[PDB]
Amino acid sequence: RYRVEYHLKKDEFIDWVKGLLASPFVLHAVSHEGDYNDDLATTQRVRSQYADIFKDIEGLIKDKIEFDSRNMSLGQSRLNLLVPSIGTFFTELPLEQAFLWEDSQRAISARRMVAPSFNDIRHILNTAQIFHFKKQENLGKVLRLVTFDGDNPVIPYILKLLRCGINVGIVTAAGYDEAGTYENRLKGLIVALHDSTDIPVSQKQNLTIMGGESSYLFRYYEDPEEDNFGFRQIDKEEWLLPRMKAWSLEDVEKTLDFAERTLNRLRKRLNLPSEISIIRKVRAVGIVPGEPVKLDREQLEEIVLTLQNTLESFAPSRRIQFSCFDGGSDVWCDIGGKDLGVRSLQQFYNPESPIQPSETLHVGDQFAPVGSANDFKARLAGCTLWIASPQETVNYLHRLLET
Template sequence: MTSQYRVNYHLRAHKRDNLIEFIKGMLLTPFVLHSQPAPAQLPDGTRENNSSSGDDNSRSSPEEEANAERYAGIFSNIELLINEHRELMQQGIPSYSRLARLVPSIGTFFTALPLEQAFRHINKNNKISARKYVPPSFNDIRRILNIAQVMAIAEGLQLVTFDGDMTLYADGQNFEPDSELTGLLIGLLQRRISVAIVTAAGYGADAARYEQRLAGLLRGFADAGLSAAEVGRFYVLGGECNFLFRCRADYRLEFLEDSQYTSSELRSWTDAQVQQLLDVAEAELADCVQRMGIRARILRKPRAVGLVPSDTLTREQLDECALSSQVALLKFQGSPKSQPCDVPIPFCAFNGGGDCWVDIGNKLIGVRIMQELVASPPAATLHVGDQFLSTGNDISTRAACCTCWIVNPEETRGMLTELDAILDQKQEYSD
């Protein structure tokens, strides 16, 4: 039984986020022992029906309020663990922190996280503490972490980078002209915050292809009459980190040669090295097609190779292709126990939702290019994406900046709306 559990755990490991799982476990105790809220009793002795959880006038029972305080206390204690971890990171001994012992894979926190405040904010509308049968979930905690990060970074924010598909627009689609995200992105640019779309889509130096995908957004810039300085803060970085464009005053994208920005790491890779790595990836994807009986095309690009299925594949099949490619490329570069970021030529092998791609370079390099270009430190940089599992291509950015993990463009809109409200509030105070 133990060995079977171990096998199952390792099979699931690429679908887990250890910090979120840790917080879920901490919140499970008060849920199991105390989550029995009853409807509030009105003066006439009847019970109030709080079915409309978003109503600000709805009452909370004493039991629910007590349970909310228990949850809030746990988030407060996790804040303390994070603060201790950050202090020990500054001393160069992060592995000595209590959080590192509890969650050995924990990474870097570039800001403090006001988790208790974020929980209270979300609980006010979603009534997590009122639930009797559904404990705080992965998505609940993910959203709380997102809001906490937005609260923490808002005041000093200088750069926001976004994934494309499933973050700003539907998978494989274009940025719609009527998207509510247009106004929110314009608002960032007008606040002198740089915005970059860091996407896996690799069309080389062909600006027209990227303009086609982003036509709705670029048209929104024109309709809003953004100045040259404002649109000059908008960038597109394609192929994870390989093809950089900047928006011109005429609302068109201009390709920037490597020599126009700092990319010494990219320029150190020879074409022969890149093609050799892609040969290995292509062979591994071909093997996946053969052994799993997949009907698919394998597409080769200058700095990427991908598997595009003829039929819809399951998530498990795509994960298998991504993980197989990761292992093959790590072995080829002599570091089978390393991470894709820690080898001579970093790469990204990821499940794209409907396909699987292997890109030379990754979004960690892409975000760092943008940080150097606009002089934004990690604590002032926020990356927003939907692929933060180990088979995703956003996870590497956690080593370079703060992050928000969303699952669709609607969540991106909600997150940016929260950010906009916080920035407005801070501006009112400063005025």
């Protein structure tokens, strides 16, 4: 009833839009008995009601952009007063056009029983972002950086992104400190890249892997001098953000030491199978599946929550920044985070003119309680796409890259 365990463990903006859309739906749309005559009329009016609302939100976003532009780098944006937990909008969003296009496909205005869904709005928001970047191309601030979530139909589109002179970064929560591992699982991307004759080697090496959220950076290399292809680790000094440089190594190791100890305690208390392994690396410590032998989500969630709470009461850990991740059957504790990794890549690709958030798009699937490495953090560093299927990713990439 009243959950006493509620605070021990949703996108408000989207639910907000859903509420605004539901009011005309229940009043005008819910007119089920109707196809005898007035359902063209009902659909038409309902479509207009929805379109108007999205157009109103368009202006609210643009007002927020302007307010945030001048007053940031204490007032509040209108939209921020309406939606307190809303994230920054680095780009304009043609919501009305996006809706009308999606309504063409899925006939949302033509429904009388099923209100505009969370997925409906999510698709509109994603379509709007893509539409924005395509608009700049036929003029603006075009898309310079696309990032993906590591922790196949997508592989070709990655290659063409690179050919179109767009930097591609793969952000993973994996704490592996050796290139070799990433070469072993990103095999297909590496060899298909390598084996492709079209791409100049310059564009070929614009592919990067930001491991440990923002702990390790690897870049693609092609040395057919040796016919050696794969990923080369980049020295910290080139890609490390200034604030991260200030972190003491002692606090880093102390943080990782305390984390690894906490993991082992959790292991014993939870009496986890011995096939479950705790892996410690240079900038990361994590727990991994075994043999077949996996971990329950409650166990994964217990681990992340325990790690976050303990470390947040650990002084070395607060003098730095850390992230936790429990997406798959693995829980990773890494130094840094999603936002830091994306912004590091922005500076890395062009130090003289760092890639702006307005020119950055993070196609991510970790908009969930996957930990502090959630893709909501990525909204701090740039524009994002919210994908729920690999096909969704391909669809979005296809329309983006369509001439």
